[PDB]
Amino acid sequence: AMKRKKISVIGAGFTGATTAFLLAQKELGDVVLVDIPQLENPTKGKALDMLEASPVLGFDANIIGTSDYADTADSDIVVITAGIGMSRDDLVTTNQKIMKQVTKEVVKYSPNCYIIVLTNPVDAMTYTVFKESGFPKNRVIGQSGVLDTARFRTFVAEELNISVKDVTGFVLGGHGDDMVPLVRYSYAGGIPLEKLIPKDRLDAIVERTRKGGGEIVNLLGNGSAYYAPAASLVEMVEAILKDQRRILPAIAYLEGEYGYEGIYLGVPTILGGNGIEKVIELELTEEEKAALAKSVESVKNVMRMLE
Amino acid sequence: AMKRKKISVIGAGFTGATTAFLLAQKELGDVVLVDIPQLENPTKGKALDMLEASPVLGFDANIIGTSDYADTADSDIVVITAGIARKPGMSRDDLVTTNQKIMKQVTKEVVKYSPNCYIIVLTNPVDAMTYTVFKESGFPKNRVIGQSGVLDTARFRTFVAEELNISVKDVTGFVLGGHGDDMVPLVRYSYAGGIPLEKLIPKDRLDAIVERTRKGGGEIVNLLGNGSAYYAPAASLVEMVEAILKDQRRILPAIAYLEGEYGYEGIYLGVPTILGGNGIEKVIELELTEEEKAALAKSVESVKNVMRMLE
Amino acid sequence: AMKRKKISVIGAGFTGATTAFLLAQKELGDVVLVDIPQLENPTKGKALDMLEASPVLGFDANIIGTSDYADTADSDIVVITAGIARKPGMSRDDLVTTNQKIMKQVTKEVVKYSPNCYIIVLTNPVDAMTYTVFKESGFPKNRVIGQSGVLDTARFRTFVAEELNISVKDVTGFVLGGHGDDMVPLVRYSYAGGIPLEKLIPKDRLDAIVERTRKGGGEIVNLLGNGSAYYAPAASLVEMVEAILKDQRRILPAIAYLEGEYGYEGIYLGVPTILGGNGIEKVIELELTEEEKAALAKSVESVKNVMRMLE
Amino acid sequence: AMKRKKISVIGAGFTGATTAFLLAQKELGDVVLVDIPQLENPTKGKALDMLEASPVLGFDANIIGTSDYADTADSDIVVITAGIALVTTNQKIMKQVTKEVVKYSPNCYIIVLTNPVDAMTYTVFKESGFPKNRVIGQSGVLDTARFRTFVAEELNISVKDVTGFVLGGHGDDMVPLVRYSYAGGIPLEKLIPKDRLDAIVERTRKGGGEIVNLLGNGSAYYAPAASLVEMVEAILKDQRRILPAIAYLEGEYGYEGIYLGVPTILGGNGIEKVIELELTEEEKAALAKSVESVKNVMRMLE
Ligand SMILES: NC(=O)c1ccc[n+]([C@@H]2O[C@H](COP(=O)([O-])OP(=O)(O)OC[C@H]3O[C@@H](n4cnc5c(N)ncnc54)[C@H](O)[C@@H]3O)[C@@H](O)[C@H]2O)c1
Ligand SMILES: NC(=O)c1ccc[n+]([C@@H]2O[C@H](COP(=O)([O-])OP(=O)(O)OC[C@H]3O[C@@H](n4cnc5c(N)ncnc54)[C@H](O)[C@@H]3O)[C@@H](O)[C@H]2O)c1
Ligand SMILES: NC(=O)c1ccc[n+]([C@@H]2O[C@H](COP(=O)([O-])OP(=O)(O)OC[C@H]3O[C@@H](n4cnc5c(N)ncnc54)[C@H](O)[C@@H]3O)[C@@H](O)[C@H]2O)c1
Ligand SMILES: NC(=O)c1ccc[n+]([C@@H]2O[C@H](COP(=O)([O-])OP(=O)(O)OC[C@H]3O[C@@H](n4cnc5c(N)ncnc54)[C@H](O)[C@@H]3O)[C@@H](O)[C@H]2O)c1
Ligand SMILES: O=C([O-])CC(=O)C(=O)O
Ligand SMILES: O=C([O-])CC(=O)C(=O)O
Ligand SMILES: O=C([O-])CC(=O)C(=O)O
Ligand SMILES: O=C([O-])CC(=O)C(=O)O
């Protein structure tokens, strides 16, 4: 008997929905879209509106909304986007319990699933999910590398006036100040960008990448990015579901890699049927090594804010 | 030096934004997303967040957010989802009228910078609002269309897919007239891989599917609480956009301007149509049963009702 | 471990190659192109060529070429196209026996290495060649499938599409019976956007179209001069493969072991089918006219008259 | 009135036919299949077989087979695959081909595949009367794609994440830069030692012959048709890709008066510009050994 893949997308907000919707139209499998019971009606409203567009886009996928994790039973992938002028401490603590509470139900109804976390801060929350899940390091990944690279590509595209298919960004660690960009491993059709873009403009593109998610927040006035984040999540689900062995930047457990371990950190990754198949150790220059250390201690910080 | 197509989506709300997103990702061309001046930053927020997903999904489109119609310069297709939704305290006539003025302000600007474009109208009441854009655009009837029956058949097909547990791709569906009580389904022209549905589903459930397809927009309003359908409505718009942009000569129900078709004239109404590169190519004039001919009459008195509400 | 679906395409000729290329392209799995040892070199040269396309079209599928059934191990779907064509000074009986022979020798080696595969058969005469495969496979009826209906309705839809000047998306067809002459197309079950084709095409034009579809294959071999159609055939195979692999529960006309449906038993025939993750989920029994029951018995007559040449 | 993009595939054999299907499949537009009027019927039934697959795959595309060039009227793109499974034999086809092609589609971009392609595209360029951006060759997209394959098998990572770059002719004329190839963006020199990297460069070079040598009585059509289509799509969708492509140099790299595989921007106006990679002392010397052969083939012409 052939069964289509089953993907459960927890949190039915702006990214979780846009994600659920891409997942459906591509026919990567049936999508179960979960939120708290107070938002179950909306979440079934957002499932069904999506599913009523299944005749029109000509895609065969089931899309249901629910407040009940029994609907998540036997998922291949689980993507967690669930999350809430307030302190860093109370954001990390608040989202952390939500990570613990989402996880216990997820792994319970989905024992052999791969989990992809988006939740902010995705460095410490994927940690929380890794921990809480019990799962071996390969089955728990965070998104942040692919969205940063994607921002930098777009900027590098609209600067050279070429295709986004031809620009490859290389981002290490998390977002903004925690970002360790590798421009030397960034190209336009394999041409090092550092020979196409002048430093001042390239330094600008780096900082805008850093300031990329804040920038959308200020544009919207109410909320953060969901389109590009959503597209980031799907592409990593596409990698696992189709064992594509993608080299993409992911948030990943480190067990000695770059001389660090017992943390999550955004690193070069091979993405396939066993989720994270290989963390990749680059040989890094002295500035990169030292800037990575800032970013590692900047993640050990939020992890001191975990309870 | 023959370049990308240009689609401008007026209103950067849930429908305009979702629709713009689908358009770009199918590389149907460059998308200019347009809303009011207060909401320029949020629009640009939506178009920037879209474009930034393009290196991920591997589609090459320009997408911009803007309240300056300069940016819609020489658009091939224009989708109007620019609209008020019901304001608690509003009469039918106030919405109807509030929305018409928006059509006039939006249309004027659309033919100013894109006088040789094709216009697809979602704004409620769509029957009355596509008419507004036709008589203010000064366009030929073929260059201005309303979306309505795609979303109603897409709804109908899902419930029928769900009843018979078969691919939505092999379920079809026919409706003339509008949404709600205006909707004029032909079960006799609805099927499952070419088996008329009446042979497959009992009468209680089949009537039940029709009823669910009148109330279909309401179903989605009641579940969300605030807001309305966007994904199904956006896909629908995208089907009609795709038809015209690729000259597909599809047979879709669209809101088109009758000039004697079914012996009605000077109006827009949901009729079967060829949709292709000349917009609405033909209105298909079916031979209906007296029943159908007369339920369509009720449906057309409805469209007249609203039409008497235009200032 | 999440693993990709594995498909094996027996016979690396025009149809089997093409099928292997389309499958690869859709990322529907890993593809194993399988001919006789004498054509192993050219079969590996196709698989590599196909695989060398994948950086360009942008799919990750693994394609290799073998004579050896060992690289078909634990295959989910096997698509049997392997066969010989008509050789001059050879009768009906000797192509049938020779192909049957091949059907039997391919299948003992397919069901050894892939015991829980679904098998889609193309080899002409398909209805008997499907029947052989089902006897030698010892698999239940739902796992052994033939292609013929989708090819022919595609041919029919293409002729109506030409005839009306509309997209083929909105043309629906339905054909029971084998191929060529022994082919039963229901014009009453054929529509252009849900509208019966009898209301749109006059009877001379609609009968001739029905006649072009009967001769549909021969038309192409007469134009080619040397060999039979491969694009339309391989596409047909892919939709059927895709329906099993994404459990899409399509209503498709497939070749299916009849066990009382349409008043027939103990044969494989073109019939209505729901094609899903469990192969042939169910044959759908239509209400036919006596003209159609006699028209289908004519097909079964030529079909059974072919089955007789077996052993 | 909105109207389809039209693509005439000149050559209705293995590469010509395989290209037109894909093109129709992707809905890049309407497709005229062409060959000699002898082979008018085999063409037409390639055209019909393909158009008969459209209901099943579900793409709206007119695919027609013809030997009358009138039916290739108004083509946006013209794909030249008319050759013989001899630079003088394939030269003399280009000349008769190009004259009718500029005559029905005078506005059209010409992407050529016929071997020896840099010399056959050059021959197309000279008869065409068109600008240097309007006549393109296909080489590096195929060789590079053979490279990314071999580099994909070797590391077992996605093909999508392998990058490649080959400058120069088709065969032992190829000068791919292993230092402008990567896997995940991380240079291959760092991922693969010199004896196995040398082997991938070697296998890339023989690439075409490996395909001939297995097949027995033809050459490559699946990777070649995809390579053409990618280049069609760049022009038809103004994609503005940086693809390896055969391009008429007028100074570039201190070479001119010759077609040769070089980095380019490929998009709406065809080849918009060729890109000048500054090269290691042995890449320049090696590019020259490739050209100096290439030039000879053009002293095989007329
Ligand atoms: N890495 C990134 O891409 C990135 C960028 C944007 C968003 N984010 C983070 O991703 C998350 C998603 O944000 P969004 O834009 O989708 O916002 P949103 O508020 O619209 O979505 C959040 C949803 O999660 C639900 N939720 C909250 N607690 C839950 C619980 N215990 N169980 C189940 N559902 C619960 C809420 O009810 C809400 O529907 C946030 O934490 C945000 O900070 C980070
Ligand atoms: N007829 C149908 O088939 C159908 C289906 C669903 C939606 N609709 C209609 O579509 C309309 C809006 O749909 P939505 O769900 O996206 O709503 P929405 O309110 O979220 O989005 C509408 C957007 O239009 C903008 N707008 C208002 N007046 C404008 C003007 N003069 N110029 C430019 N932009 C302007 C608003 O700022 C808002 O952002 C409503 O009238 C709704 O009834 C009808
Ligand atoms: N059902 C349909 O609609 C339909 C349409 C087209 C073709 N067909 C039939 O399908 C078959 C395929 O024809 P084609 O166009 O590919 O012709 P072809 O001869 O080019 O392809 C068939 C291939 O089968 C191979 N083969 C033979 N014996 C084999 C064996 N024991 N194991 C493995 N491979 C073996 C041959 O070596 C040959 O390469 C024919 O029997 C044809 O009549 C039916
Ligand atoms: N240079 C490259 O990048 C590359 C890659 C693969 C193939 N090729 C070349 O592609 C070309 C075609 O290859 P193929 O494998 O399709 O061969 P093929 O089997 O298609 O033979 C060439 C086709 O062109 C037709 N043709 C010949 N003269 C013609 C004329 N005067 N007008 C119109 N059509 C004519 C032939 O009848 C035949 O259909 C050959 O030159 C081959 O060497 C080179
Ligand atoms: O925290 C934010 O500002 C949002 C963010 O990082 C992101 O979008 O990736
Ligand atoms: O009016 C509304 O609320 C929206 C609507 O018609 C629909 O979705 O069909
Ligand atoms: O019938 C034939 O001769 C070949 C065939 O199956 C087809 O193409 O339909
Ligand atoms: O020489 C040939 O026949 C074609 C060729 O270069 C190739 O396939 O790479």
Sequence-distant (6+) residues with CB within 8 A of D249 are: D255, D256, D257, D258, D259, D260, D262, D274
If contacts are CB pairs under 8 Å, which of residues 55-84 in chain D contact chain B?
60, 76
Q: E-strand spans in B59-161? A: 63-66, 77-80, 118-121, 144-146
Domain range summary for chain B, segments of one domain joined by +: 6-146, 149-309
Q: How many CA atoms lie within 13 A of D255 on its CB side?
A: 22
Say whether residue B4 is in contact with chain D using an 8 A CB cutoff: yes
What's this structure's resolution in Å?
2.2
Please answer yes or no on whether C45 and D160 come within 8 Å at the CB atom.
no
Task: Say if ligand 7 is within 6 A of residue C228 CB.
Answer: yes
Q: Which residue out of B157, B179, B212, B214 is catalytically annotated? A: B179
Q: How many CA atoms lie within 13 A of C72 on its CB side?
A: 29
Q: Which two tokens stand for residue C161?
A: 């599409």
Identical fold at B6-146 and B149-309?
no
Question: Contact, B210 vs B221, CB < 8 A?
Answer: no
CB-defined contacts A:C, below 8 A: 39
Say whether residue C192 is in contact with chain B using an 8 A CB cutoff: yes
- Which residues of chain C make contact with A242, given a CB cutoff of 8 A? 4, 27, 60
Chosen CATH of B149-309 out of 3.90.110.10, 3.40.47.10, 3.40.50.10860, 2.160.10.10:
3.90.110.10
DSSP A72-134: GTT-SEEEE-------HHHHHHHHHHHHHHHHHHHHHH-TT-EEEE--SSHHHHHHHHHHHH-
Task: Say if ligand 2 is within 6 A of residue B17 CB.
Answer: no
Question: Contact, B43 vs B66, CB < 8 A?
Answer: yes
Strands A246-255 and A191-192: unpaired
Residue D106 has a CB neighbour count (10 Å cut-off) of 12
User: What does the DSSP 8-state code read for residue B180?
Assistant: T
CATH topology of domain C149-307: L-2-Hydroxyisocaproate Dehydrogenase; Chain A, domain 2 (3.90.110)
D206 Cα–ligand 7 center, Å = 38
Residues present in chain A in total? 307
- Output the 3-class SS for chain D: CCCCCEEEEECCCHHHHHHHHHHHHHCCCEEEEECCCCCHHHHHHHHHHHHCCHHHHCCCCCEEEECCHHHHCCCCEEEECCCCCCHHHHHHHHHHHHHHHHHHCCCCEEEECCCCHHHHHHHHHHHHCCCCCCEEECCHHHHHHHHHHHHHHHHCCCCCCEECCEEECCCCCEEECHHHCEECCEEHHHCCCHHHHHHHHHHHHHHHHHHHHHHCCCCCCHHHHHHHHHHHHHHHCCCCEEEEEEEEEEEHHHEEEEEEEEEEEEECCEEEEECCCCCCHHHHHHHHHHHHHHHHHHCCCC
Gap between the Cα atoms of B156 and B162, Å rounded: 10
User: What does the DSSP 8-state code read for residue C285?
Assistant: P
Q: Tokens 């041409």, residue?
A: A191
Gap between the Cα atoms of C49 and D175, Å rounded: 21
Q: Tokens 């460069």, residue?
A: D201
Say whether residue B177 is in contact with chain C using an 8 A CB cutoff: no
Please answer yes or no on whether B251 and C199 come within 8 Å at the CB atom.
no
Closest CB to B247 among D4, D239, D269: D4
Sequence-distant (6+) residues with CB within 8 A of C299 are: C176, C177, C178, C182, C183, C184, C269, C270
Task: Say if ligand 4 is within 6 A of residue D113 CB.
Answer: yes
Q: E-strand spans in A237-288? A: 246-255, 261-272, 275-279
- Which residues of chain A make contact with B238, given a CB cutoff of 8 A? 56-57
Question: Contact, A10 vs A78, CB < 8 A?
Answer: yes
Question: Hey, which of C95, C123, C124, C306 would you mutate to test ligand 7's pocket, going by the most ligand atoms within 8 Å of its Cβ?
Answer: C124
CATH number corresponding to B6-146: 3.40.50.720
Largest CA distance in chain B: 59
Q: Is residue C261 exposed (0-12), middle (13-18) or buried (19+ Cβ within 10 Å)?
A: middle
Please answer yes or no on whether C245 and A3 come within 8 Å at the CB atom.
no
Is C202 in a helix, a strand, or coil? coil
Gap between the Cα atoms of C291 and C293, Å rounded: 6
Residue A27 has a CB neighbour count (10 Å cut-off) of 18
CATH topology of domain D140-298: L-2-Hydroxyisocaproate Dehydrogenase; Chain A, domain 2 (3.90.110)
Query: Taking Cα atoms as reference points, which of B23, B270, C131, C58 lies closest to residue A246?
Result: C58
Please answer yes or no on whether A56 and B220 come within 8 Å at the CB atom.
no
B307 Cα–ligand 5 center, Å = 48
- Measured in degrees and rounded to the nearest 5, phi and psi for residue B304 equal -60, -50
Taking the alpha carbons at both ends of chain D, their separation in whole angstroms is 45
Q: E-strand spans in C170-238? A: 171-172, 175-177, 183-185, 191-192
Task: Say if ligand 7 is within 6 A of residue C151 CB.
Answer: yes
Question: Contact, A243 vs B72, CB < 8 A?
Answer: no
Task: Say if ligand 2 is within 6 A of residue B300 CB.
Answer: no
> Which residue puts its alpha carbon closest to atom 9 of ligand 3?
C123
Chosen CATH of A6-142 out of 3.40.50.720, 3.90.870.10, 3.40.50.150, 3.40.605.10:
3.40.50.720
Confirm whether residue A138 is marked as ligand binding.
no
CATH topology of domain A145-305: L-2-Hydroxyisocaproate Dehydrogenase; Chain A, domain 2 (3.90.110)
D255 Cα–ligand 8 center, Å = 25
- Measured in degrees and rounded to the nearest 5, phi and psi for residue D150 equal -55, -35
Looking at chain A, which subunits does it touch, using at least 3 CB pairs closer than 8 Å as the criterion? B, C, D
Q: Name B255's bridge partners.
A: B146, B270
Tell me how many degrees the CA angle C210-C214-C218 measures, rounded to the nearest 5.
135
Confirm whether residue B94 is marked as ligand binding.
no
DSSP A144-194: SHHHHHHHHHHHHHHHHT--TTSEE--EEESSGGGEEE-STT-EETTEEGG
Q: Tokens 């190659």, residue?
A: C17
- Does the CA dihedral D19-D24-D26-D30 come out positive or negative? positive
Question: Contact, D149 vs C55, CB < 8 A?
Answer: yes
Q: Which residue out of A175, A179, A197, A253 is catalytically annotated? A: A175
Query: Taking Cα atoms as reference points, which of D60, D89, D72 lies closest to residue D2?
Result: D60
Gap between the Cα atoms of A271 and A273, Å rounded: 7
- Measured in degrees and rounded to the nearest 5, phi and psi for residue D65 equal -105, 135
Confirm whether residue D12 is marked as ligand binding.
yes
Sequence-distant (6+) residues with CB within 8 A of C265 are: C258, C259
Task: Say if ligand 2 is within 6 A of residue B95 CB.
Answer: no
Q: Name C120's bridge partners.
A: C79, C145
Question: Contact, B188 vs B265, CB < 8 A?
Answer: no
Task: Say if ligand 1 is within 6 A of residue A174 CB.
Answer: no
Rounded (to 5) percent helix, strand, coil in chain C = 50, 20, 35
Q: Name B119's bridge partners.
A: B78, B144
Confirm whether residue C8 is marked as ligand binding.
no
Closest CB to A230 among B53, B153, B222: B53
CATH architecture of D6-137: 3-Layer(aba) Sandwich (3.40)
- Which residues of chain B make contact with D3, given a CB cutoff of 8 A? 247, 277
Q: Is D235 a catalytic residue?
A: no
Gap between the Cα atoms of B216 and B155, Å rounded: 7
Strands B175-176 and B184-185: antiparallel
Crossing angle for the helix pair A227-241 and B40-51, nearest 10 degrees?
A: 20
> Which residue puts its alpha carbon closest to atom 39 of ligand 2?
B13
Q: Which residue out of C5, C6, C46, C179 is catalytically annotated? A: C179
Chain B: closest CA distance from residue C136 (Å): 31
Sequence-distant (6+) residues with CB within 8 A of D194 are: none
> Which residue puts its alpha carbon closest to atom 3 of ligand 8?
D219
